[PDB]
Amino acid sequence: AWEIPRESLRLEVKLGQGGEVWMGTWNGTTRVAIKTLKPGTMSPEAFLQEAQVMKKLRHEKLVQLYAVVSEEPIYIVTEYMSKGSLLDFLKGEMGKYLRLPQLVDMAAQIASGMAYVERMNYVHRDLRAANILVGENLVCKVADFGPIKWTAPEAALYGRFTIKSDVWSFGILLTELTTKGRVPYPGMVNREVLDQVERGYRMPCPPECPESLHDLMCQCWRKDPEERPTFEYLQAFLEDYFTSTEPQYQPGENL
Amino acid sequence: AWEIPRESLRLEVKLGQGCFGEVWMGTWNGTTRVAIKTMSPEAFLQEAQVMKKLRHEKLVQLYAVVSEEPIYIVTEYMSKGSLLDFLKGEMGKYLRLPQLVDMAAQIASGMAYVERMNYVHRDLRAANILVGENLVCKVADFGFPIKWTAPEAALYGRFTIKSDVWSFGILLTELTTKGRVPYPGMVNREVLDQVERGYRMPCPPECPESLHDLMCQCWRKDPEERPTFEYLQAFLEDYFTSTEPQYQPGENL
Ligand SMILES: Cc1nc(Nc2ncc(C(=O)Nc3cccc(NC(=O)c4cccc(C(F)(F)F)c4)c3)s2)cc(N2CCN(CCO)CC2)n1
Ligand SMILES: Cc1nc(Nc2ncc(C(=O)Nc3cccc(NC(=O)c4cccc(C(F)(F)F)c4)c3)s2)cc(N2CCN(CCO)CC2)n1
Numbered sequence: 456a457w458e459i460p461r462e463s464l465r466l467e468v469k470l471g472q473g474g475e476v477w478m479g480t481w482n483g484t485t486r487v488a489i490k491t492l493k494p495g496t497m498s499p500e501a502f503l504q505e506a507q508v509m510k511k512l513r514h515e516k517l518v519q520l521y522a523v524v525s526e527e528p529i530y531i532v533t534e535y536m537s538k539g540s541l542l543d544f545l546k547g548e549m550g551k552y553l554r555l556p557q558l559v560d561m562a563a564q565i566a567s568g569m570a571y572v573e574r575m576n577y578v579h580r581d582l583r584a585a586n587i588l589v590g591e592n593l594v595c596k597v598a599d600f601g602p603i604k605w606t607a608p609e610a611a612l613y614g615r616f617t618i619k620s621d622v623w624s625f626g627i628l629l630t631e632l633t634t635k636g637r638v639p640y641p642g643m644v645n646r647e648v649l650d651q652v653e654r655g656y657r658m659p660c661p662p663e664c665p666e667s668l669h670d671l672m673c674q675c676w677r678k679d680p681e682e683r684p685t686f687e688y689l690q691a692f693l694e695d696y697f698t699s700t701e702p703q704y705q706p707g708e709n710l
Numbered sequence: 711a712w713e714i715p716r717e718s719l720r721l722e723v724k725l726g727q728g729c730f731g732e733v734w735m736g737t738w739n740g741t742t743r744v745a746i747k748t749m750s751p752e753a754f755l756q757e758a759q760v761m762k763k764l765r766h767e768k769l770v771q772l773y774a775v776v777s778e779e780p781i782y783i784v785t786e787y788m789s790k791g792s793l794l795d796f797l798k799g800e801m802g803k804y805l806r807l808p809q810l811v812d813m814a815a816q817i818a819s820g821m822a823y824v825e826r827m828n829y830v831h832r833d834l835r836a837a838n839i840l841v842g843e844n845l846v847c848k849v850a851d852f853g854f855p856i857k858w859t860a861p862e863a864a865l866y867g868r869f870t871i872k873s874d875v876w877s878f879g880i881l882l883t884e885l886t887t888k889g890r891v892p893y894p895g896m897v898n899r900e901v902l903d904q905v906e907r908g909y910r911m912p913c914p915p916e917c918p919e920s921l922h923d924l925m926c927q928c929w930r931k932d933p934e935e936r937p938t939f940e941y942l943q944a945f946l947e948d949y950f951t952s953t954e955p956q957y958q959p960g961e962n963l
């Protein structure tokens with residue numbers, strides 16, 4: 456039903472490697488993003504399993520599936536995000552100019568997309584800035600390109616991947632936004648992280664970040680997954696942040 | 711007259727910050743739990759002078775004051791904090807319409823006294839309402855909230871008890887939406903222009919039409935067409951018998 460011929464697609468510029476992700480034109484008018492599969496690395500039935508997930512999910516804050524190519528090489532066609540990954544965006548030229556009102560709005564958009572995933576009873580399992588795509592007018596959309604520092608302890612240790620383990624990951628994503636794409640738990644290795652978070656270690660409040668936003672991060676990092684907040688609460692809290700939580704917020708040198 | 715030495719009060723835990731000072735939880739004479747508030751000294755002490763004249767059960771009661779700088783305005787302690795934080799927090803999901811209407815009835819009672827005393831609050835909203843034990847709500851003042859202010863008070867500075875009624879209508883949306891910011895998606899600029907052309911917030915989800923009609927009565931273009939807090943108090947106290955006798959609890963209200 457979602458099938459289209461290869462003749463309609465024209466791969467123009469390569470964006471990432473691993474298969475690989477391209478920027479092209481569908482039917483010679485619509486600018487699209489094409490994720491190709493390198494044969495041998497993964498079977499076509501296992502690669503199209505991701506598109507099966509995208510067929511059931513439809514929201515303004517999720518990367519929208521456009522079409523699929525069942526003939527090898529396998530193509531998964533989606534909408535094009537002009538600014539790339541949130542991680543590269545935060546690390547790049549734009550990072551210096553982004554302040555807390557922009558970063559909280561981006562966080563509110565991600566929380567909205569994840570609030571849909573919550574309602575649909577789906578689990579992302581790899582929520583991070585690298586899996587968030589940025590477009591025009593600071594539009595952020597939840598994606599998956601295919602991460603112990605971002606994974607909840609029960610999910611990393613006992614494989615208990617839930618929407619509450621995604622909430623934990625969203626808490627880590629908040630540190631990425633407030634540190635301008637810096638890797639969580641700086642100086643700590645994957646083994647050091649897993650053992651310290653069990654003993655109750657949590658990342659301290661990032662510099663220039665208000666305590667109220669770090670409290671929200673700490674709510675996302677509660678040992679008991681059931682005690683963690685919903686993405687519905689996170690969306691509402693982040694949308695209303697500069698009126699209800701920080702009305703006396705003053706811009707600084709970085710945040 | 712209300713004066714007490716500095717050695718009596720002890721500031722233990724910081725509750726709030728910003729504005730002119732800070733709200734602190736402490737102990738007065740080492741027996742009773744109190745709240746202490748740390749602009750010219752004559753301007754800050756003027757707030758405590760107003761509190762000396764206002765005495766009501768649904769108003770934060772003034773206990774003591776320190777005249778010389780640094781000034782310490784001592785009041786009663788509200789264990790649950792601001793109504794906004796209370797609604798936004800863990801308690802929000804459990805609060806239904808009978809509780810929220812009872813809370814609104816208590817705020818209307820406090821504001822009914824304010825009305826009788828010919829006083830104007832000027833900043834009535836959930837952030838200036840404090841919650842205690844057994845859902846006791848008391849009117850407070852922590853010191854622009856255009857979304858809560860009436861058009862005549864925002865544009866022409868015509869601050870009255872009728873403009874406080876407008877603010878109470880917005881507070882009713884805060885209660886029924888569980889602390890959500892009014893006029894969602896709208897900025898203070900497009901709020902003033904839309905409200906002037908006649909725009910009013912629609913009925914919140916699961917909220918009865920009868921409570922939205924009361925919100926709209928508080929939001930009448932002509933301030934003298936707005937109801938009294940005495941009417942608002944009586945309407946909310948009798949709500950589940952006179953207005954909604956066949957009310958059934960839902961998923962959120
Ligand atoms: C790597 C990259 N991608 C860019 N844009 C993209 N737009 C869409 C992309 C993409 O990954 N599309 C795609 C293709 C196939 C499948 C998928 N699926 C998903 O991402 C996916 C999978 C499962 C679930 C979900 C969801 F929504 F639930 F969370 C999503 C997504 S990648 C731009 C860019 N830029 C850097 C280069 N500059 C300059 C020009 O070269 C432009 C910005 N760099
Ligand atoms: C900010 C905050 N205040 C709390 N409790 C409070 N109780 C009283 C407070 C207070 O503002 N007291 C105070 C001190 C000095 C002056 C004033 N005055 C007024 O508020 C005032 C001034 C003028 C007029 C009016 C009136 F009534 F007409 F409207 C009122 C009030 S603040 C608790 C709390 N929390 C609840 C639990 N804790 C942790 C417990 O360990 C965290 C949050 N958070």
